[PDB]
Each structure stands twice: as structure tokens, then as C-alpha cells.
From Swiss-Prot, chains A, B:
Subunit organization: Homodimer.
Organism: Homo sapiens (Human)
Any further remark recorded for this protein: Potential cerebrospinal fluid marker for the diagnosis of Creutzfeldt-Jakob disease.
Biological process terms in GO annotation: defense response; immune response; negative regulation of blood vessel remodeling; negative regulation of collagen catabolic process; negative regulation of elastin catabolic process; negative regulation of extracellular matrix disassembly; negative regulation of peptidase activity; negative regulation of proteolysis
Protein's name according to its UniProt entry: Cystatin-C
Superkingdom, taxonomy of origin: Eukaryota
Motif (Secondary area of contact): 44-48
Gene coding for it: CST3
Taxonomy of the source species: Eukaryota, Metazoa, Chordata, Craniata, Vertebrata
Family: Belongs to the cystatin family.
Subcellular location: Secreted
Keywords: Age-related macular degeneration, Amyloid, Amyloidosis, Disease variant, Disulfide bond, Glycoprotein, Phosphoprotein, Protease inhibitor, Secreted, Signal, Thiol protease inhibitor
Free-text function comment from the UniProt entry: As an inhibitor of cysteine proteinases, this protein is thought to serve an important physiological role as a local regulator of this enzyme activity.
Portion of the parent chain present: 38 to 146 of 146
Length: 109, 109
């Protein structure tokens, strides 16, 4: 994984100032806090794949608690059916075999 | 930016099943929802740099609302001083000039 990097390095210093900026902004403290000591600084290049999916999604008549969900019929009754257009952004790191849902938003159709 | 990708492609299908999985888990709905139609599927390789910073952070006597904060003296009074060891993880995409704080946790020292 990650490897040691000098704090003198512009990237490491920029990231430190930034993190301490965010820590400060998120705090409920009226006092400014700042670094006493940097105990360790490491860094790692990462590549990944973003998928950007525009998908219409529809409500089915199966409950989440039952078998064979992936070709289950959509509701057709007046106040039961629901359809939305969703935008999903998925960040995959394939050597790791992981996926994260970075972004998710829908509008009723 | 991103480029069109067939839904037949194992990566695109895996990401779709995953997103719809998450959408379902996050919902308050007892019914299963599923894709009616995939309107678009695009994908983009991204590289970035994670910085992993272990930093002791100390409370200063300046307020957030005043000048010259970065060599301001630490509190020394009994119930005013505070010190913590923090772990920050910063995700940088340097062509874009952005940084995000992916992870942030501290323990009082």
C-alpha cells in the first residue's frame, strides 16, 4: 500500500493544510486549532473506474423478503405504482473487487 | 470525460446491479424496485492520490475570525488546552486541482 512522503513536498503540505482547514470548519470550536506535530505522512496513487448510469427504476409487487426478484412484475394500480429516473455514480476499484455509490439522485416520472 | 459503455459489459452490469441494490437498501419501501430501462451508461477511468496523515493537532488562543493563524500560540491553561491525534485521508485529483477529505478521526491526547 502507501509509502512515506516528506511534509516538505508540495502535495503533502497542500493536503495537510486542507485537512486541518476541514477539521477546523467542522468543529464547533470558536478557537482555531493547528498541527502540533505530523506523526506520519504516506501517499498512494489509486486508479478506479467511475460508472455513470441513467436508469428508470420501477416499483415491483414482490417484497424485499421473498424469492426471484429480478423479473417480478411492476405495480399497475393507481396509487401503488411508482417510477423514477435515477442517476447513479459508482466508483469501482477492480483489483480490490469493491464498488461504492458516490452519487445517487432520482426524480419521479 | 466519460464514454458510452454497453450494459452487456460485465463491469457496467455489475455496477447497475449494485446501484439498484443500494437504492433498494436505502429505501423505506417494503417493495422491491428494479430497472425499467437503462437510459444511458458511460464510464471513465480516474486516477488520484490518497494522502494518509497522522497529525497531532492542538487548540490555539486565536479565534477563527482573526489574522495570522498559523503560528498562533497554543492554550496552556488547565481546562482550555486540547490536543488530539488525528488521522486524515485526503483524495486528490491533481489535474483537476481538487481535494476531498475521505476519512477523518481523532482521539484526545
Amino acid at each position: 500500500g502507501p509509502m512515506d512522503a516528506s511534509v516538505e513536498e508540495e502535495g503533502v503540505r497542500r493536503a495537510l493544510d486542507f485537512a486541518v482547514g476541514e477539521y477546523n470548519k467542522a468543529s464547533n470550536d470558536m478557537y482555531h486549532s493547528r498541527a502540533l506535530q505530523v506523526v506520519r505522512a504516506r501517499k498512494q496513487i489509486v486508479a478506479g473506474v467511475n460508472y455513470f448510469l441513467d436508469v428508470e427504476v420501477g416499483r415491483t409487487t414482490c417484497t424485499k423478503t421473498q424469492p426471484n426478484l429480478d423479473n417480478c412484475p411492476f405495480h399497475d394500480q393507481p396509487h401503488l405504482k411508482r417510477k423514477a429516473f435515477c442517476s447513479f455514480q459508482i466508483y469501482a476499484v477492480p483489483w480490490q473487487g469493491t464498488m461504492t455509490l458516490s452519487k445517487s439522485t432520482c426524480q419521479d416520472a
